[PDB]
């Protein structure tokens, strides 16, 4: 027989009937062809188990994942990996879009820190993409009054009524005259991708001494943060500078390239988190090496 599966993208939703023997590879390919997306390697189908995200493996049966079996079996089609340079690597317009949406959401949900002024400029572009050029005759007062525009963190740092923000944003919106949709979303991407937290996968760890720290994985390398400060890593290890990383019983070891360097060792208590880090390290490292050829 078959089961139903729900695939949620940032944009939309879709349903599929799947044979009981279907693997990750089968769903993934199906979703990608539907989207007409060829740049598939930034993506993956994720689901959350316990409090940890999980990505469907290609060669395992879908149902052999510890995912809630209550039909429809739901997966989110999200980006697993970020390019080092959006404008250069996101060739297909559909790839651009999906990234844009997913990034804007992380900015509004405050998963990515974003200074007040950047939040405004971003908004003015998010607005241009959704609305097209600004027509003063068409776009009248309060035409943005029901729109998530800025992170809450930003709104309550100022003595400003929502209408004033919307006036600020409109002022910059007007400057984006003549800018096509994909032009705007990419402007958004170009700004957002310089945000210090953009594209960084955080994890709680602690070192040999047992003091609590944060691990950060992204397109550039592995990073170590003081739990209070996520903007600036205390230590960075670029991919080209790492021989490899080893995992062994809730312990990782970053084995640097220069034998000169001391190894870096840290601990994480959750197994599921650990597999995730390991996947993320491998894939980010791969893509990094691929760019360099």
């Amino acid at each position: 027989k078959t089961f139903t599966v729900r695939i949620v993208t940032m944009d939309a939703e879709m349903e599929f009937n799947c044979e009981m023997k279907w693997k990750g590879k089968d769903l993934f390919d199906l979703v990608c062809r539907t989207l007409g997306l060829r740049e598939t390697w930034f993506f993956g189908l994720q689901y959350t188990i316990k409090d940890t995200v999980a990505w469907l493996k290609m060669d395992k049966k879908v149902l052999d994942h510890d995912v809630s079996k209550e039909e429809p079996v739901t997966f989110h089609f999200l980006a697993k990996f970020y390019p080092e340079n959006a404008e250069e690597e996101l060739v297909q317009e559909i790839t651009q879009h999906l990234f844009f949406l997913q990034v804007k959401k992380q900015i509004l949900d405050e998963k990515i820190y974003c200074p007040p002024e950047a939040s405004v400029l971003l908004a003015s572009y998010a607005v241009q993409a959704k609305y097209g050029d600004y027509d003063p005759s068409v776009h009248k007062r309060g035409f943005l009054a029901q729109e998530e525009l800025l992170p809450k963190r930003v709104i309550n740092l100022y003595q400003m009524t929502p209408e004033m923000w919307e006036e600020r944003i409109t002022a910059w919106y007007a400057e984006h005259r003549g800018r096509a949709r994909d032009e705007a979303e990419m402007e958004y991407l170009k700004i957002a991708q310089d945000l210090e937290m953009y594209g960084v996968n955080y994890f709680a760890i602690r070192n040999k001494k047992g003091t609590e720290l944060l691990l950060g994985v992204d397109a550039l390398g592995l990073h170590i943060y003081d739990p209070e400060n996520r903007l600036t890593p205390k230590i960075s290890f670029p991919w080209n500078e790492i021989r490899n990383i080893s995992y062994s019983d809730k312990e990782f070891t970053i084995k640097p390239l220069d034998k000169k360097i001391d190894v870096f060792k840290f601990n994480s208590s959750k197994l599921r988190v650990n597999k995730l880090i390991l996947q993320l390290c491998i894939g980010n490292h791969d893509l990094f090496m691929r760019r360099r050829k």
Binding site: P115, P116, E117, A118, V120, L121, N156, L157, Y158, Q159, M160, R168, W172, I191, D194
Partner: peptide
Amino acid sequence: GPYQKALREIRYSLLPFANE
């Protein structure tokens, strides 16, 4: 980068209304 100036102009105009 090329947004330095827009970011600065924006930051400067918000500054008067920042929380005490």
